[PDB]
């Protein structure tokens, strides 16, 4: 609630991911801006190692919930800003239905004026011509609701939600998300009553960009209380 003040106005973002899926190494670097007042994120991510061995949509969730818009009557339920600048750790298992599993570990914290997300991603059990490794996913991302609950004993929060990726053949590839977040610092944080975040994203491409990349526009709002 004191860290709320760091997200007035527009904040530069740096994202950095080191990944390994079924042995294929790759790095992603992203940069952009976030405006929590309007719950709006604009970012451009670039695969620095070459061609991205997975579809870009499967990395959206891994690639900064502190930029969500919490209505005034919900401010005391915003865990993510309360942890700043000191930051938080974010851990996920992402289980793709009848395909592999991603495991991710990340620090989200300020480094000066910039909010940084450093991620380590680990992927196993992907069938070499599934929807993921066989690049069979549409270049888009559907709207979702992320349900948050408190994790009082780790002084953090948890979330469970389902991501529905559109497959180029009309079917839908689903990805179960299990997530927990813990303060990095010792200072106090807001622990919340169960709410959800409602998200909407637009994916696009930079025509002047030759590297494999993703431009992303996100709008996130908190809801579900009183």
């Amino acid at each position, epitope marked *: 609630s004191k860290g709320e003040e760091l997200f007035t106005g527009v904040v530069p973002i740096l994202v950095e991911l080191d990944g390994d899926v079924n042995g294929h190494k790759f790095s992603v670097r992203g940069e952009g801006e976030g405006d929590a007042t309007n719950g709006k994120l604009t970012l451009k991510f670039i695969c620095t190692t070459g061609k991205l061995p997975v579809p870009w949509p499967t990395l959206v969730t891994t690639l900064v919930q502190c930029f969500s818009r919490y209505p005034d009557h919900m401010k005391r339920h915003d865990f993510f800003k309360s942890a700043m*600048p000191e*930051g938080y750790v974010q851990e996920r298992t992402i289980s793709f239905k009848d395909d592999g599993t991603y495991k991710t*570990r990340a620090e989200v914290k300020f*480094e*000066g004026d910039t909010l940084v997300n*450093r991620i380590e991603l680990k992927g196993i059990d992907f069938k070499e011509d599934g929807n993921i490794l066989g690049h069979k996913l549409e270049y888009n991302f559907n709207s979702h609701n992320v349900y948050i609950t408190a994790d009082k004993q780790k002084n953090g929060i948890k979330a469970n939600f389902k991501i529905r990726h559109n497959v180029e053949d009309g079917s839908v590839q689903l990805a179960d998300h299990y997530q927990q977040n813990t303060p990095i610092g010792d200072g106090p944080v807001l622990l919340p009553d169960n709410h959800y975040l409602s998200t909407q994203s637009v994916l696009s491409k930079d025509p002047n960009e030759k590297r494999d990349h993703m431009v992303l526009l996100e709008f996130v709002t908190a809801a579900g209380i009183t």
Partner: nanobody, 126 residues
Framework: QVQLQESGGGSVQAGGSLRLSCAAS????????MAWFRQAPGMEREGVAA????????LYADSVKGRFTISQGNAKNTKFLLLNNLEPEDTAIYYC?????????????????????WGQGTQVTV
């Protein structure tokens, strides 16, 4: 959880130079703001030099007078502190400190409570 290799102390005559090392082994997604403090015999820990994770900000205390330089290491969270033009007043044990918590500014860098993980130090004698 996170561990601290520190190396490269020793002894010199007035004017000489030594290079301290420090590396942080831990989760490879973690970044640390890294510093060296030094403690004289019965005096307190004071700040010497400090540098952000990316080498983008580098800070020195008044006792340094542009004689000491931090340089970024080969690897992720590893750095060297080069001590030039050493004088007997610089004799002390030199502790590597790491800050994992995020930060908005570096005004606090000279306080030991700004950090999170400390070394055992190394001796530096002239």
């Amino acid at each position: 959880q996170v561990q601290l290799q520190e190396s490269g102390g020793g002894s010199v005559q007035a004017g000489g130079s030594l290079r301290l090392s420090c590396a942080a082994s831990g989760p490879t997604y973690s970044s640390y703001f890294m510093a060296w403090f030094r403690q004289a015999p019965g005096m307190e820990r004071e700040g010497v030099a400090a540098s952000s994770y990316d080498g983008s900000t580098t800070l020195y205390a008044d006792s340094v007078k542009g004689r000491f330089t931090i340089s970024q290491g080969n690897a992720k969270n590893t750095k060297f502190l080069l001590l030039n033009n050493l004088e007997p007043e610089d004799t002390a044990i030199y502790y590597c400190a790491l800050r994992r918590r995020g930060w908005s500014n570096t005004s606090g860098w000279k306080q030991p409570g700004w950090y999170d993980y400390w070394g055992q130090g190394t001796q530096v004698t002239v």
